[PDB]
Amino acid sequence: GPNICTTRGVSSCQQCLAVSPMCAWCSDEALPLGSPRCDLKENLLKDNCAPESIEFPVSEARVLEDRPLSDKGSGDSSQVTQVSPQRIALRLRPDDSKNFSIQVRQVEDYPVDIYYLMDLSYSMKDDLWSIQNLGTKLATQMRKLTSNLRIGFGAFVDKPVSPYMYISPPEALENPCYDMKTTCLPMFGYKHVLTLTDQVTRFNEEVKKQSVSRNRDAPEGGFDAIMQATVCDEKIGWRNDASHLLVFTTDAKTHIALDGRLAGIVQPNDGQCHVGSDNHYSASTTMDYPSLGLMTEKLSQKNINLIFAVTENVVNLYQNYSELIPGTTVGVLSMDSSNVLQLIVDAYGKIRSKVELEVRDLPEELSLSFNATCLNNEVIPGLKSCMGLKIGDTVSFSIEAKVRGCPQEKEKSFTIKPVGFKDSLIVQVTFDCDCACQAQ
Amino acid sequence: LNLDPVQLTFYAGPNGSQFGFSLDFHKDSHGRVAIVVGAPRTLGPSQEETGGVFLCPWRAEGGQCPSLLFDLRDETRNVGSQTLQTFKARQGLGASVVSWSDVIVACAPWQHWNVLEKTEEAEKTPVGSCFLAQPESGRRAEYSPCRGNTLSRIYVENDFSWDKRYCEAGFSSVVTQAGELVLGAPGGYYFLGLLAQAPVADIFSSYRPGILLWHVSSQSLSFDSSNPEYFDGYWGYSVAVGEFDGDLNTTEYVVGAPTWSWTLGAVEILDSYYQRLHRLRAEQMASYFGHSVAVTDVNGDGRHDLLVGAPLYMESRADRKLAEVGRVYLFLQPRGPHALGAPSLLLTGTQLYGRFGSAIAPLGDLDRDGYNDIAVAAPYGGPSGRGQVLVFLGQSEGLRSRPSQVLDSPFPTGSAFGFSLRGAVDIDDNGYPDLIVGAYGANQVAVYRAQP
Numbered sequence: 001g002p003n004i005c006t007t008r009g010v011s012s013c014q015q016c017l018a019v020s021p022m023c024a025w026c027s028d029e030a031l032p033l034g035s036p037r038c039d040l041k042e043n044l045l046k047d048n049c050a051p052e053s054i055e056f057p058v059s060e061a062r063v064l065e066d067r068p069l070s071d072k073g074s075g076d077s078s079q080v081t082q083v084s085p086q087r088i089a090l091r092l093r094p095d096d097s098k099n100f101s102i103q104v105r106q107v108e109d110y111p112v113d114i115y116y117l118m119d120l121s122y123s124m125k126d127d128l129w130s131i132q133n134l135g136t137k138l139a140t141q142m143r144k145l146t147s148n149l150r151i152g153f154g155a156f157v158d159k160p161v162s163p164y165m166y167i168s169p170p171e172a173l174e175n176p177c178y179d180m181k182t183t184c185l186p187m188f189g190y191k192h193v194l195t196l197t198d199q200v201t202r203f204n205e206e207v208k209k210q211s212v213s214r215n216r217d218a219p220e221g222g223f224d225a226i227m228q229a230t231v232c233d234e235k236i237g238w239r240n241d242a243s244h245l246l247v248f249t250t251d252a253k254t255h256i257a258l259d260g261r262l263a264g265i266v267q268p269n270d271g272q273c274h275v276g277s278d279n280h281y282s283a284s285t286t287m288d289y290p291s292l293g294l295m296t297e298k299l300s301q302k303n304i305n306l307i308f309a310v311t312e313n314v315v316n317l318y319q320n321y322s323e324l325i326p327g328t329t330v331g332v333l334s335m336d337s338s339n340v341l342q343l344i345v346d347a348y349g350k351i352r353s354k355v356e357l358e359v360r361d362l363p364e365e366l367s368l369s370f371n372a373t374c375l376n377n378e379v380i381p382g383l384k385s386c387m388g389l390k391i392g393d394t395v396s397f398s399i400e401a402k403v404r405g406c407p408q409e410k411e412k413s414f415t416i417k418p419v420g421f422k423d424s425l426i427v428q429v430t431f432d433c434d435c436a437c438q439a440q
Numbered sequence: 441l442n443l444d445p446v447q448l449t450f451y452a453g454p455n456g457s458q459f460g461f462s463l464d465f466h467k468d469s470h471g472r473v474a475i476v477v478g479a480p481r482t483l484g485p486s487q488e489e490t491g492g493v494f495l496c497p498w499r500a501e502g503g504q505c506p507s508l509l510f511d512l513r514d515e516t517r518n519v520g521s522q523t524l525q526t527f528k529a530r531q532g533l534g535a536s537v538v539s540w541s542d543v544i545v546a547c548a549p550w551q552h553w554n555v556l557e558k559t560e561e562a563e564k565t566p567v568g569s570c571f572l573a574q575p576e577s578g579r580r581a582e583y584s585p586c587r588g589n590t591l592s593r594i595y596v597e598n599d600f601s602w603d604k605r606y607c608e609a610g611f612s613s614v615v616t617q618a619g620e621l622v623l624g625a626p627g628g629y630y631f632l633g634l635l636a637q638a639p640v641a642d643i644f645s646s647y648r649p650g651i652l653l654w655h656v657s658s659q660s661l662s663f664d665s666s667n668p669e670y671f672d673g674y675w676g677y678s679v680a681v682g683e684f685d686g687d688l689n690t691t692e693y694v695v696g697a698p699t700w701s702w703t704l705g706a707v708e709i710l711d712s713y714y715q716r717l718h719r720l721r722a723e724q725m726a727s728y729f730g731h732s733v734a735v736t737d738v739n740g741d742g743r744h745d746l747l748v749g750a751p752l753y754m755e756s757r758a759d760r761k762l763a764e765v766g767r768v769y770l771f772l773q774p775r776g777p778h779a780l781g782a783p784s785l786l787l788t789g790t791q792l793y794g795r796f797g798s799a800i801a802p803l804g805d806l807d808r809d810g811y812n813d814i815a816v817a818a819p820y821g822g823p824s825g826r827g828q829v830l831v832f833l834g835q836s837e838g839l840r841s842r843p844s845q846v847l848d849s850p851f852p853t854g855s856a857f858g859f860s861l862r863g864a865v866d867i868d869d870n871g872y873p874d875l876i877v878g879a880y881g882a883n884q885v886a887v888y889r890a891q892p
């Protein structure tokens with residue numbers, strides 16, 4: 001009966017609205033000059049008010065632009081839409097709260113980075129075609145799975161130190177193959193040749209200009225290269241937001257930590273970057289090979305997926321090392337690239353992204369709340385983040401905006417967009433305070 | 441029993457020389473006790489890393505020690521049509537030291553060698569070499585069983601048969617009680633690994649100053665193999681001697697091959713004729729099972745037991761993950777003509793990357809309770825990762841699964857505290873065995889005394 005709108009009714013229509021969202025008004029003179037001017041809607045009807053002079057605003061928030069979420073990307077990705085309602089006009093009265101909806105879908109292709117590691121030792125001579133073809137076929141397979149790629153590559157042989165490296169006669173330093181009446185490049189530990197880039201055709205030309213070197217012992221320093229390609233952030237060019245694939249090749253055994261003592265090297269591997277301006281692993285001759293453990297730690301620390309593309313004569317060996325380093329796959333390198341390519345396909349299919357909403361520029365006198373509904377369709381209030389979604393999957397959120405009074409900013413706007421996305425929901429806020437010109 | 445970690449003595453060498461990389465007790469032709477210390481990066485008067493040996497007399501104060509003089513300059517000799525030449529640059533003299541009653545033996549695993557004949561050579565390669573010294577008489581002798589005079593081309597046609605060009609002889613070493621020197625050449629036979637031995641007396645007597653390639657008549661080397669399991673095994677990366685076949689008239693060898701059978705690692709017991717007696721394979725690839733190998737009777741039964749270090753062992757932690765901590769393996773000798781079965785005990789490290797098992801030294805009977813004890817190094821162990829040596833006591837069923845004493849490193853980081861260890865000798869002469877610990881990274885050697 002007596003209600004909170006009446007207990008405080010004072011003198012203006014505006015002031016009546018500033019009391020509560022549920023209060024109405026009535027500028028109809030046909031009412032006794034002592035009856036409730038400010039009261040509920042039903043109460044004003046019983047008091048015989050003309051539904052024409054009543055001023056009872058309501059919050060609505062209408063959907064302006066909202067083209068559905070797309071279902072492709074191959075052909076031309078102009079500007080695609082993966083967010084729901086890109087722009088809505090939210091108009092609300094003092095202290096009221098209006099709720100709206102928004103839903104996203106992962107439509108863009110996952111960013112993928114592949115770094116090829118070429119074993120360029122002499123035993124690789126008869127395999128050179130295979131690793132060049134693979135390196136070329138690599139860029140192709142991924143480009144077909146994701147229009148967003150950054151490929152690159154580097155090479156290794158072993159530690160340029162006796163007894164691995166031939167140190168006589170003097171011609172052998174520049175041409176290790178000298179003794180065989182043939183000619184090859186001088187030895188080197190690890191060399192970074194091509195930084196990660198989107199220029200696929202330039203990657204292919206560069207990979208095909210590669211030739212072998214020579215070393216004395218079958219085991220090589222591939223692990224020195226895996227370590228360096230992993231811990232040299234800026235040099236390699238890994239892009240933090242993307243999936244990192246590290247394909248490694250070899251046709252022989254490998255040097256593990258503690259092997260370096262044959263070269264007089266005893267300092268345990270520090271696990272840090274040592275590839276300077278010259279693009280060479282400078283510690284190669286002074287630091288020992290890394291142990292399996294240090295590798296694993298670093299691979300995880302940098303979120304790099306190690307893949308072994310090795311010849312069949314050494315496959316079992318790398319499978320066994322694969323078990324000692326979890327999360328690493330092994331493929332058999334050869335003229336036929338089906339096998340090792342599958343590993344790249346799989347790695348992609350295992351990628352998961354996440355929708356985490358963020359709020360940019362929202363008035364201080366305004367506050368939000370969310371009711372998320374992920375994959376399992378289980379609604380959880382307060383939360384505004386969903387995980388484990390593949391490509392195409394859709395996730396929705398329920399948003400509620402609340403104000404404190406009636407701001408002198410009469411026109412403002414804010415944005416709600418998930419991180420890792422460009423598509424955002426822009427909300428135009430309008431505060432309806434004043435009445436329809438009601439006077440008495 | 442308890443080794444005092446406060447009134448400990450310190451010995452030191454030049455900066456960067458890696459003083460303490462190797463060490464041994466020297467009981468001279470006289471009677472006092474000294475410490476032979478190897479420093480493989482010690483500069484020569486030519487200002488190039490040739491290595492060096494130091495002979496430290498006992499003194500609670502410690503400090504500097506006299507240098508044990510050795511020929512540090514390159515040799516070149518012409519024999520007929522060949523020019524024989526030895527290169528000492530970065531040869532690492534003292535990368536392995538070992539004293540046997542009267543004489544000291546230091547080795548340069550990385551000393552290079554070459555032979556020239558017209559327009560063909562044999563190659564310049566690390567055959568390695570050992571320098572023998574008798575400090576009293578000031579005498580010297582040399583032993584380099586791997587130097588050859590076969591030209592490069594011949595090996596290519598033989599398909600690299602009996603190729604001792606990269607031996608790295610003296611990489612590791614031991615002298616039996618009877619005076620036979622046993623050298624470990626992990627690079628031998630094109631990286632298979634080999635072992636060479638000869639009687640110290642014969643090495644001295646057959647040596648002639650000026651001759652660079654000679655055959656010590658009473659010598660014998662291991663063999664080359666075509667069995668893939670031995671390829672790149674490094675058989676000889678470490679060695680030890682002991683009694684394992686029951687016949688006390690014959691001594692047997694214990695060899696470490698840390699990379700045997702595709703990095704699976706292994707250790708072997710052989711007689712003096714290199715005939716195989718047994719083989720302990722490892723349990724994890726890349727663990728470096730064979731890195732260290734100790735021999736002693738830990739349970740008082742009168743028969744030698746075997747200790748094997750695998751410093752790189754990755755332990756199975758909860759949640760499908762692994763952790764590199766290192767591990768030691770105990771093998772007790774079952775009596776008579778019987779095979780050494782599975783490991784009687786698995787001591788395994790705790791600190792990550794500490795490389796537990798990196799070194800194992802048989803102490804004597806610390807507590808005198810009638811059971812021999814041992815000390816295990818973990819050069820990068822401890823909360824700080826500054827390294828720490830753990831003492832394990834002799835029980836009746838083997839050894840105590842718990843370390844009775846934990847000696848921490850008094851040196852800074854990278855000291856490699858523990859990399860080398862030697863015990864079972866009464867240095868202070870108080871009827872109790874002591875322990876010396878090398879920390880090449882700090883260029884020092886710490887001495888721990890046994891006290892009542």
Ligand SMILES: *[C@@H]1O[C@H](CO)[C@@H](O[C@@H]2O[C@H](CO)[C@@H](O[C@H]3O[C@H](CO)[C@@H](O)[C@H](O[C@@H]4O[C@H](CO)[C@@H](O)[C@H](O)[C@@H]4O)[C@@H]3O)[C@H](O)[C@H]2NC(C)=O)[C@H](O)[C@H]1NC(C)=O
Nearest residue numbers: 314315316317318319320321323701702703704719721725
């Ligand atoms: C990759 O890892 C696999 C998994 O370990 C390796 O395969 C195993 O290799 C074993 C040899 O190292 C091989 O033999 C052992 O197990 C056999 C089981 O049937 C068994 O026949 C053997 O028994 C005897 O062992 C004694 C030694 O105490 C010998 O004296 C005898 O002659 C017998 O060999 C062995 O216990 C095992 O069968 C095999 N298992 C699998 C999963 O295939 C593989 O070699 C590794 N590859 C490499 C080189 O990297």
Ligand SMILES: *[C@@H]1O[C@H](CO)[C@@H](O)[C@H](O)[C@H]1NC(C)=O
Nearest residue numbers: 098099100101102398399400
């Ligand atoms: C807004 O919330 C009300 C109740 O709080 C509910 O009835 C309505 O379905 C919501 N509208 C939207 C945005 O779907």
Ligand SMILES: *[C@@H]1O[C@H](CO)[C@@H](O)[C@H](O)[C@H]1NC(C)=O
Nearest residue numbers: 099369370371381398399400
């Ligand atoms: C969120 O859900 C709770 C209870 O499920 C409800 O009270 C609240 O009004 C909802 N708000 C939004 C943002 O829809």
Ligand SMILES: C[As](C)(=O)[O-]
Nearest residue numbers: 121122123214215
């Ligand atoms: C070690 As090679 C024979 O591949 O240079």
Ligand SMILES: [Ca+2]
Nearest residue numbers: 123124127251
């Ligand atoms: Ca090949």
Ligand SMILES: [Ca+2]
Nearest residue numbers: 158217219220
């Ligand atoms: Ca090699």
Ligand SMILES: [Ca+2]
Nearest residue numbers: 687688690691
């Ligand atoms: Ca015997």
Ligand SMILES: [Ca+2]
Nearest residue numbers: 737741743745
């Ligand atoms: Ca025993």
Ligand SMILES: [Ca+2]
Nearest residue numbers: 805806807811
């Ligand atoms: Ca004891």
Ligand SMILES: [Ca+2]
Nearest residue numbers: 866870872873
């Ligand atoms: Ca003593």
Ligand SMILES: [Mg+2]
Nearest residue numbers: 121122123252
């Ligand atoms: Mg090769």
